[PDB]
Design an enzyme around this catalytic site. Structure first.
Site, short mmCIF file in Angstrom:
data_model
loop_
_atom_site.label_atom_id
_atom_site.label_comp_id
_atom_site.label_asym_id
_atom_site.label_seq_id
_atom_site.Cartn_x
_atom_site.Cartn_y
_atom_site.Cartn_z
CG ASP A 74 -1.85 -1.25 1.23
OD1 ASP A 74 -2.63 -1.48 0.25
OD2 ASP A 74 -2.06 -1.81 2.04
CB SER A 80 -0.27 5.77 4.13
OG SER A 80 -0.69 4.53 4.92
NE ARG A 81 -0.81 3.17 -2.37
CZ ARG A 81 -1.02 2.71 -3.40
NH1 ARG A 81 -1.17 3.30 -4.44
NH2 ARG A 81 -0.80 1.24 -3.50
CB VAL A 82 -5.49 3.24 4.48
CG1 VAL A 82 -4.92 1.88 4.26
CG2 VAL A 82 -4.54 3.73 5.91
N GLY A 83 -4.94 6.39 3.87
CA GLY A 83 -5.00 7.94 3.98
C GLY A 83 -5.40 8.21 5.52
#
Ligand SMILES: Nc1ncnc2c1ncn2[C@@H]1O[C@H](COP(=O)(O)OP(=O)(O)OP(=O)(O)O)[C@@H](O)[C@H]1O
Ligand SMILES: Nc1ncnc2c1ncn2[C@@H]1O[C@H](COP(=O)(O)OP(=O)(O)O)[C@@H](O)[C@H]1O
Ligand SMILES: [Mg+2]
Ligand SMILES: [Mg+2]
Lengths: 54, 504, 469, 55, 127
Positions: free
Chosen positions: B341, B366-369
């Site tokens: 991710d 980070s792509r869960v943000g």
């Protein structure tokens, strides 16, 4: 008058030194990319020729 | 009573006879046995030789079978007997492993005693599908002021720690084990975390120094360490990543939470390449086989956030990857980047310029943000991320800048002082309620008159104050989760009272 | 059990047996030669046919020479009697002073100690070199590495630590030389008689020597380093003394196995090494350890091929070393000697709980002003030196005095220099560098610190330059 | 290239490691400037009065 | 000459073509090619040639033998496969540069890079 004449020519002569350094920076990016592919190609042949003769 | 326990074991031993499906050895060399016979072996099935070593049969060929050896081949002579066990490889798993040192096959190497685990589990299982998963929302607390502010980690996310040699990649993943002590001795059952650490090809003296570091901080009563070292055979450094997820999936299957650290995954692709080219498989780019993407994908996809109908468990995965000269465009640094991710990119230039931990926040994502941050941390760090990003645009004017606009002089003034809040000593993990207070002191504007060298001394003074004299405010951000309007005024006179009389 | 020779290609000899097959890693004696030629078994091939590697040359071999078997691997002689002697790979003495007469024979192929036989304690071993003790301290019982290219000083810096450390040390010492020039094994036998470390008249010597050099066949440059750390395992295990171990070079253990590989039938990996590269390296480097029966300090020189630390042979030894001392050609071409890179050398004990908080904030204070000096050179190339401000005309002049103060005149390099040998203690190295950083020597030119010892000689050399104007 | 983690990015201290025209113009300017500072700091170091009494 | 008191000197011009001709002689014997198709032991080729150029003592005769091998490089690359195997064998170097040639110094010798072990300082007494 002389500190205005000088401070404007420092603005222009530092501008053409960033155009000529960005014109030069694309021509070395193509040669970097031809040479990056040519090394993955070259050392792939040496492994295949080493295994075929074995 | 030393004679009695030895007499006890040998009457409790099982000496029974069975059948077998044996087959003689054809040609042993460099750790690849060729066995003639064994007409009913499955693929990837464990056999065992006549001396005592074990073997895993990878190539099912017409006239022979290629079986790797779990040891050294000086004990294997041509003309031996290769018996069959009849089962794929399985590891012991359970609660009893907590606080032990194990190798890649579940044996005990620390010499305390044998494992009393009653269950057993395969290593080749599959990931859960699309339906038993749910989106990641709970925070996984690391304890580093730069990770939890700008590149957060949720409970089910895969986050890659990528960087060169000797830049604190092991140290970031060794205080994340220490920081979860504050939840692991309390009462809240849905906030505990369990850590597993897999060492793949390191020397034995380094692992013996790291267990003592985790014994000192009283953090080896909820941690397991799986050690496949450098001296051990080439396939034991291949099983050891898959022998740790099978111990981190017993906590996901039973409603608990977990954490796993692969240190490191760039020494598993090398221990697997040697096994391929000795079994005569067709090579590829940098002599890796055609399925090294399929080797790392089915290990990281086992990390999942389960939903409430299956238990609500989780599994969080942190792999370490060593680049060479900072080139992430190699073969293995591009496989594991496209699977996971986000990355944490530790440079070597910032390590010697004083920035320690040397996290580059220009390239870390980070792509869960922001959906894994608490409400308190999200409110202050949303402006800090925007404030630091405006500083990195104008970092190249600092070396010769005095003839600039007062906004640009301000943007430099806040960027230097926000950087000093991000530096942190080793083995000192903080709390989220103490982290949000230090960021709140900086992002509001309460530091633009303090000298940039004093920002470290001011911070260690201010933190020891609010632990003893304002303990009832750091229980109304820990339990509340958010920062209200009542706590906004109550924190406001605190950093104004301390800043007034500070320099003494 | 006799066997015949059926094929000879290069250094790889095939031997077919008939009734008794010897296991892998044994010794086979070729009958029929005037010299002794030993073959080491490496693979099995079926129908009672092994494939061996030869320890000596293979000229004059014919298909049909009857070959005996030993029943055991290469057992060299070992004991206290081997001190002060040069010996071969298989244990023959080549000092021409007679047979080595001892009682213990020991194979060179043995296991590694387990996880509950490791030691955990750390110390600091003081040497006397200013770059080493300040920024990357060495340790007792810890593995030390000396990196760098060709012709920067790896053999001289490993000749310096026999000069300082080995005579003040209590226990014994072992030097294994693997794949280097045969001249330089004679400038060690003649620089250790005139210093009394090797004694040719009685039984008071303190150094053993094991030599396999670069004229040997490539099956013999890959079993000499296993013969060095077999003698050095006797002193640690069967006795209890503190042992040292010096190895130069160790890149010639990896390279000499990348030559016999393609005839044994293996596909090559990346840039040309064997597929089993990082396994037999990690099988030797797990015997050089400090156990609960002794302690082995070990210094190793590691050749880096054509100045590239991303080559697969030097970039996998990093996992086995505690203190790395990366040498560099970009420093050595300034005249700064020893050319040690300060921004590339590490240690595991650079730790303010081990070296104290005063040494720690001095080490990082030096690296921070050197790294900030690097980013300033990019401005001087376009602007110039004089157009800078007065505040960073000072951090350059403080950095240039720190570069030059690290260079120290060595003792064994007198014939290169003519200067004298200095040995700065540990308490003086810190106090020398606090005062250049704080600004107590801003009134001296840069040349007053070049090739000096302690900081006392930096001002005595300052006045002597002044009077000749 | 540089507007991604994958592409090549330049670090600090890359004009001297190249060793070209600007890498040689920088070394001879740090030396021709700090040669005059070994003159003014050595000429004023002879102005110690105790040495003159010995003279 | 070395075993019988007298002195000698030998020049190999050059040692690169002694490896291009050993590659081709060893490819046609059906042996697997290594890096740049050179055989696996082109270190053992040269390192037993230059290791016989010794200097003996008075109990064995006192005669010597001195070598001067020549190596050709392809456009200044001193980091290739064969130009670096020999550099780690010899005792000195004389780097001729083509950038110095057309400027006007002949013999063009890069004196900054042309290092040599002096030989226990046996230059002479007068120079
Ligand atoms: N926050 C920090 N501040 C100061 N020093 C640190 C910090 N974190 C780590 N170090 C130091 O950096 C050194 C090396 O760090 P570490 O071993 O974690 O890096 P690594 O890259 O994981 O190592 P390897 O390359 O062996 O995997 C250690 O000696 C440690 O003391
Ligand atoms: N104390 C020293 N400081 C700096 N350079 C040295 C020193 N001693 C020797 N050298 C240089 O190192 C070069 C190679 O020396 P040596 O260490 O024998 O070779 P290598 O390191 O390649 O094995 C010599 O040309 C010599 O000029
Ligand atoms: Mg590490
Ligand atoms: Mg050397």
């Amino acid at each position: 008058e002389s500190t205005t004449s000088e401070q404007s020519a420092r603005m222009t002569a530092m501008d053409n030194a960033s155009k000529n350094a960005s014109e030069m920076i694309d021509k070395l990016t193509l040669t970097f990319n031809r040479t990056r592919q040519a090394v993955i190609t070259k050392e792939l042949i040496e492994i295949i020729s080493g295994a075929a003769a074995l | 009573e030393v004679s009695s326990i030895l007499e006890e074991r040998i009457l409790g031993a099982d000496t029974s006879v069975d059948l077998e499906e044996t087959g003689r050895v054809l040609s042993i060399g460099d750790g690849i046995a060729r066995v003639h016979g064994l007409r009913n072996v499955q693929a990837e099935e464990m056999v065992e030789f006549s001396s005592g070593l074990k073997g895993m049969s990878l190539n099912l060929e017409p006239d022979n079978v290629g079986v790797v050896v779990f040891g050294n081949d000086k004990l294997i002579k041509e003309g031996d007997i290769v018996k069959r066990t009849g089962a794929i490889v399985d590891v012991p798993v359970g609660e009893e492993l907590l606080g032990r040192v194990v190798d890649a096959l579940g044996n005990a190497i620390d010499g305390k005693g044998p494992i009393g685990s009653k269950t057993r589990r395969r290593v080749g299982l599959k990931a859960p599908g699309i339906i038993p998963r749910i989106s990641v929302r709970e925070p996984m607390q690391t304890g580093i002021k730069a990770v939890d502010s700008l590149v957060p980690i949720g409970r089910g996310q895969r986050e890659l720690i990528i960087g060169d040699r000797q830049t604190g990649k092991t140290s970031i993943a060794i205080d994340t084990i220490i920081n979860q002590k504050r939840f692991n001795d309390g009462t809240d059952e849905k906030k505990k975390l369990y850590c597993i650490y897999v060492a793949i090809g390191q020397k034995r003296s380094t692992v013996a120094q790291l267990v003592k570091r985790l014994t000192d901080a009283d953090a080896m009563k909820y941690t397991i360490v799986v050690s496949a070292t450098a001296s051990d055979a080439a396939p034991l450094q291949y099983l050891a990543p898959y022998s740790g997820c099978s111990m981190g999936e017993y906590f996901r299957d039973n409603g608990k939470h977990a954490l796993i650290i692969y240190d490191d995954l760039s020494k598993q692709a090398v221990a697997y390449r040697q096994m391929s080219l000795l079994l005569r498989r067709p090579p590829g780019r940098e002599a890796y086989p055609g399925d090294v993407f399929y080797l790392h994908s089915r290990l990281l996809e086992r990390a999942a956030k389960m939903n409430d109908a299956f238990g609500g468990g989780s599994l969080t995965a942190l792999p370490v990857i060593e680049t060479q000269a900072g080139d992430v465009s190699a073969y293995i640094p591009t496989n594991v980047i496209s699977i996971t991710d986000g990355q944490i990119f530790l440079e070597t230039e910032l390590f010697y310029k004083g920035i320690r931990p040397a996290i580059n926040v220009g390239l870390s994502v980070s792509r869960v943000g922001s959906a894994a941050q608490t409400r308190a941390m999200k409110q202050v760090a949303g402006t800090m991320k925007l404030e630091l990003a405006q500083y990195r645009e104008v970092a190249a004017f600092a070396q010769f800048g005095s003839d600039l606009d007062a906004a640009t002089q301000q943007l430099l003034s806040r960027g230097v002082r926000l950087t000093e809040l991000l530096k942190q000593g080793q083995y000192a993990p903080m709390a989220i309620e103490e982290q949000v207070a230090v960021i709140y002191a900086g992002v509001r504007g309460y530091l633009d008159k303090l000298e940039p060298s004093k920002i470290t001394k001011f911070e260690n003074a201010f933190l020891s104050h609010v632990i003893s004299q304002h303990q009832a405010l750091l229980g109304k951000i820990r339990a509340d989760g958010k920062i209200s309007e009542e706590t906004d005024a109550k924190l406001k006179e605190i950093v104004t009272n301390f800043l007034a009389g500070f320099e003494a | 059990a006799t066997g015949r020779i059926v094929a000879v290609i290069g250094a790889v000899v095939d031997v077919q047996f008939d009734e008794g097959l010897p296991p892998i890693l044994n010794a086979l004696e070729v009958q029929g030669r005037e010299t002794r030629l030993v073959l080491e078994v490496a693979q099995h091939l079926g129908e009672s046919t092994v494939r061996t590697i030869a320890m000596d040359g293979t000229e004059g071999l014919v298909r049909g020479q009857k070959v005996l078997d030993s029943g055991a691997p290469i057992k060299i002689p070992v004991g206290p009697e081997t001190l002060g002697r040069i010996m071969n790979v298989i244990g023959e003495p080549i000092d021409e002073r007679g047979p080595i007469k001892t009682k213990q024979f020991a194979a060179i192929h043995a296991e590694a100690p387990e996880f509950m036989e490791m030691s955990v304690e750390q110390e600091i071993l003081v040497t006397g070199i200013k770059v080493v003790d300040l920024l990357a301290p060495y340790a007792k019982g810890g593995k030390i590495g000396l990196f760098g290219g060709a012709g920067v000083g790896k053999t001289v810096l490993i000749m310096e630590l026999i000069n300082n450390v080995a005579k003040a040390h209590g226990g014994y010492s072992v030097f294994a030389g693997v794949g280097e020039r045969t001249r330089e094994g004679n400038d060690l036998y003649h620089e250790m008689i005139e210093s009394g470390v090797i004694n040719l008249k009685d039984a008071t010597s303190k150094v053993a020597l094991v030599y396999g050099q670069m004229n040997e066949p490539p099956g013999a440059r890959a079993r000499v380093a296993l013969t060095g750390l077999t003698v050095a395992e006797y002193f640690r295990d069967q006795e209890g003394q503190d042992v040292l171990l010096f190895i130069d070079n160790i890149f010639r253990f990896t390279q000499a196995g990348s030559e016999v590989s393609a005839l044994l039938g293996r596909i090559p990996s990346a840039v040309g090494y064997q597929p089993t590269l990082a396994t037999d390296m990690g099988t030797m480097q797990e015997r050089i350890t400090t156990t609960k029966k002794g302690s082995i300090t070990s210094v190793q020189a590691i050749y880096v091929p054509a100045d590239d630390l991303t080559d697969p042979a030097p970039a996998t030894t990093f996992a086995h070393l505690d203190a790395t001392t990366v040498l560099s050609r970009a420093i050595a071409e300034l005249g700064i000697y020893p050319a040690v890179d300060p921004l590339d050398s590490t240690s595991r004990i650079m730790d303010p709980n081990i070296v104290g908080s005063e040494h720690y904030d001095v080490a990082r204070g030096v690296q921070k002003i050197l790294q900030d000096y690097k980013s300033l050179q990019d401005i001087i190339a376009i602007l110039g030196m004089d157009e800078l401000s007065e505040e960073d005309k000072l951090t350059v002049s403080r950095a240039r005095k720190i570069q030059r103060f690290l260079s120290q005149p060595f003792q064994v390099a007198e014939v290169f220099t003519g200067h004298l040998g200095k040995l700065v203690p540990l308490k003086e190295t810190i106090k020398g560098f606090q005062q250049i950083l704080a600004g107590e020597y801003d009134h001296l030119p840069e040349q007053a610190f070049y090739m000096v010892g302690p900081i006392e000689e930096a001002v005595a050399k300052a006045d002597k330059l002044a009077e000749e104007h | 290239s540089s507007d991604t983690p994958e592409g090549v990015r330049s670090g600090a201290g890359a004009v001297r490691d190249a060793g070209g025209a600007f890498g040689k113009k920088e070394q001879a300017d740090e030396e021709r400037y700090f040669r005059a500072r070994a003159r003014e700091q050595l000429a004023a170091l002879k102005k110690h009065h105790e040495n003159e009494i010995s003279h």
